[PDB]
Design an enzyme around this catalytic site. Sequence first.
Site, PDB file in Angstrom:
ATOM      1  N   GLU A   1       1.068  -1.443  -0.032  1.00  0.00           N
ATOM      2  CA  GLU A   1       0.348   0.097  -0.287  1.00  0.00           C
ATOM      3  C   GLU A   1       0.505   1.577  -0.254  1.00  0.00           C
ATOM      4  O   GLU A   1       0.127   2.831  -0.119  1.00  0.00           O
ATOM      5  CB  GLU A   1      -0.636   0.011   1.162  1.00  0.00           C
ATOM      6  CG  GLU A   1      -1.901   1.749   1.072  1.00  0.00           C
ATOM      7  CD  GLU A   1      -2.503   0.930   2.275  1.00  0.00           C
ATOM      8  OE1 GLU A   1      -3.606   0.055   1.845  1.00  0.00           O
ATOM      9  OE2 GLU A   1      -3.335   2.093   3.058  1.00  0.00           O
TER      10      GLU A   1
ATOM     11  N   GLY B   1      -9.276  -9.717   9.773  1.00  0.00           N
ATOM     12  CA  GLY B   1      -9.951 -11.517   9.822  1.00  0.00           C
ATOM     13  C   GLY B   1     -11.127 -10.745  10.921  1.00  0.00           C
ATOM     14  O   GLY B   1     -10.881 -10.312  11.649  1.00  0.00           O
TER      15      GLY B   1
ATOM     16  N   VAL C   1      -4.435 -16.020  14.376  1.00  0.00           N
ATOM     17  CA  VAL C   1      -5.451 -16.333  14.410  1.00  0.00           C
ATOM     18  C   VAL C   1      -6.457 -17.013  13.228  1.00  0.00           C
ATOM     19  O   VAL C   1      -6.670 -16.398  12.320  1.00  0.00           O
ATOM     20  CB  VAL C   1      -6.742 -15.302  15.293  1.00  0.00           C
ATOM     21  CG1 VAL C   1      -7.626 -16.484  16.192  1.00  0.00           C
ATOM     22  CG2 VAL C   1      -6.112 -15.137  16.775  1.00  0.00           C
TER      23      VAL C   1
ATOM     24  N   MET D   1      -2.686  -8.695  13.337  1.00  0.00           N
ATOM     25  CA  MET D   1      -0.805  -8.320  14.485  1.00  0.00           C
ATOM     26  C   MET D   1      -0.290  -6.874  14.965  1.00  0.00           C
ATOM     27  O   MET D   1       0.838  -7.273  15.671  1.00  0.00           O
ATOM     28  CB  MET D   1      -0.143  -9.272  13.349  1.00  0.00           C
ATOM     29  CG  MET D   1      -1.047 -10.660  12.792  1.00  0.00           C
ATOM     30  SD  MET D   1       0.263 -11.512  12.530  1.00  0.00           S
ATOM     31  CE  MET D   1       1.382 -11.670  13.010  1.00  0.00           C
ATOM     32  N   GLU D   2      -1.024  -5.804  14.573  1.00  0.00           N
ATOM     33  CA  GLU D   2       0.191  -4.605  14.554  1.00  0.00           C
ATOM     34  C   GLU D   2      -1.055  -3.755  15.175  1.00  0.00           C
ATOM     35  O   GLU D   2      -0.251  -2.412  15.901  1.00  0.00           O
ATOM     36  CB  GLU D   2       0.565  -4.090  13.127  1.00  0.00           C
ATOM     37  CG  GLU D   2       1.475  -5.344  13.036  1.00  0.00           C
ATOM     38  CD  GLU D   2       1.070  -6.190  11.918  1.00  0.00           C
ATOM     39  OE1 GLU D   2       0.059  -5.649  11.083  1.00  0.00           O
ATOM     40  OE2 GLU D   2       1.635  -6.948  11.368  1.00  0.00           O
TER      41      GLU D   2
ATOM     42  N   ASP E   1     -11.078 -11.506   4.657  1.00  0.00           N
ATOM     43  CA  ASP E   1     -11.549 -12.735   5.105  1.00  0.00           C
ATOM     44  C   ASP E   1     -12.543 -13.071   6.393  1.00  0.00           C
ATOM     45  O   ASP E   1     -12.876 -12.242   7.584  1.00  0.00           O
ATOM     46  CB  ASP E   1     -10.223 -13.922   5.845  1.00  0.00           C
ATOM     47  CG  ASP E   1      -9.550 -13.454   7.332  1.00  0.00           C
ATOM     48  OD1 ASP E   1     -10.226 -13.595   7.819  1.00  0.00           O
ATOM     49  OD2 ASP E   1      -8.327 -13.718   6.644  1.00  0.00           O
TER      50      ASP E   1
END
Lengths: 222, 229
Positions: free
Chosen positions: A12, A79, A153, A173-174, A197
Site C-alpha cells: 500500500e 480477519g 489466529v 497483528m499490529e 476474511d
Amino acid sequence: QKIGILGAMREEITPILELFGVDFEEIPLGGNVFHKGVYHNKEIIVAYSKIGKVHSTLTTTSMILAFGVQKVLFSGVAGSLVKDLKINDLLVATQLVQHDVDLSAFDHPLGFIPESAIFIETSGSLNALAKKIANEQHIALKEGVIASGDQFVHSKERKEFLVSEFKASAVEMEGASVAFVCQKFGVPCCVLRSISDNSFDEFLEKSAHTSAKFLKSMVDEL
Amino acid sequence: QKIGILGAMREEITPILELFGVDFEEIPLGGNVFHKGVYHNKEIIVAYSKIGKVHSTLTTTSMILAFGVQKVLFSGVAGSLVKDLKINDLLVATQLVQHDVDLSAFDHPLGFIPESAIFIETSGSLNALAKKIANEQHIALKEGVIASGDQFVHSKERKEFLVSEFKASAVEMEGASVAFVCQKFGVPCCVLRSISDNADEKAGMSFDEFLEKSAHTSAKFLKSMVDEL
C-alpha cells in the site's frame, strides 16, 4: 500539521505516495524506511509498519520521536470474528487489546499489564472524520474492538476466546501496538481495517488503492 | 559516553539507582520516567519499561533516539528452564527469541517473522566482559538462550516446548525485544537475568518471594560491568 501514515501492508505504501503527488525523501531509520513529503503546508510521513508487535512498536515510536508526527492514521487488513462483519467491510477500531498478553500467573485478568490497561483508546476526532468520509463516499463504516497479537489466529477456539474475553469484532497483528504507542505519547491515532476474511492478491491491489484514496481524503480535511 | 540501563519493573531498577549512588534528574517521555545521572565521566540513563514486548520496545527506542545511549545493559529477573540454573543464579543471554510468535499458518517456523530471524544476538564485547568479570569474581555465570514472550510462563508443558523448540535456558518478557531494537539501531546490548522462579505451577509464588534478591543480584553484576566501561 505533521501527519503520520502507517500501512500494515507494504504493497500500500507506493499507492499512498503516488496519490499524494509530491516528492518524498526516503529516510532510513531503525531498519525501516520513512517517506517524508510536504503536502499543502503539512509534513506527511509514511511508512510500512512491518510485521508483529515489536516491529510496529519500533516503527511507530521511531516515527513519533524522529519526525514529531502529531496524528497517525494506520491502514491494514483484518480477519472478522463476527458474522455480520463481511469481507470488504471497512472497520474503525473504537478500542484495541493485546489478546496474547497473559499474566494470569499473578492473577491478573487476561490482556492486562500492571501500570497499563486492557483496552487501548483511539481518537474520537479522527474516527469521526473517517465516519464523515465514509458517509460522504456512501461507504458503510463499521466500528468495534480490534484484537492484536503475534499469532495468526485461525482456530475456532481462539476466535471464540477473542469474542468472549474481549468482545473483539476483528483480529490482526499490529493495530493494538501502534495505538498503544500513540496513546503513550499523546498522539491521536485512527486504526482502520479492511476485512480480508470471514483472490487475496486481487483483493489486496484493489483494497490498497481505495485505502490510499481514503487516507488522502482524511488528510485533505486535516 | 552514554549508557542506557534498563529493567522491566520498578523493583529491578531501584537497586541500580541505589548502587550508583549519584543524583538523577527525572525526565518523563512516552509514559516512562528516565533517570539521568553522571557517573565517573559517563552519562547513565536508567528506566524501567513496564512489562512485556511493546513496553520494552518503546522504552528502548526512546533511550536510543531521545537520549542517545551508545550501549544498553538490561538487568532483571527470569524463570529457569534448566536444572543448572537455580534461584538467584545469573545468566547472560547470548541469543534471544520471541517464543510466542506464531505464523505457522503461513508455514513459517515458530518464532520467525519476515525480515527478521528466529534468534537475535547480543553484544560479543559486552558478553565477553561479563564472562571475564564473573570468572575473576568467582561468580557462576551461565551463557545461553533466553526466550521472551508476553505470557508469564508457569506450566511444565510450556517449559518443555521452550526447551525443545528453542533450546532456551530461561524465560522472561522483554529480553528479545530490547535486543532486537538495539540491533536495528546498531547499539551494543547485554541482557543479564537472575533467576527468580522455575517457570512452573509455583512460579508466581517463587517470583514474589525472590524478586527483591534476584533483582539485586542482577543489578550488582550490571554495576560491576559499568565499572569496567
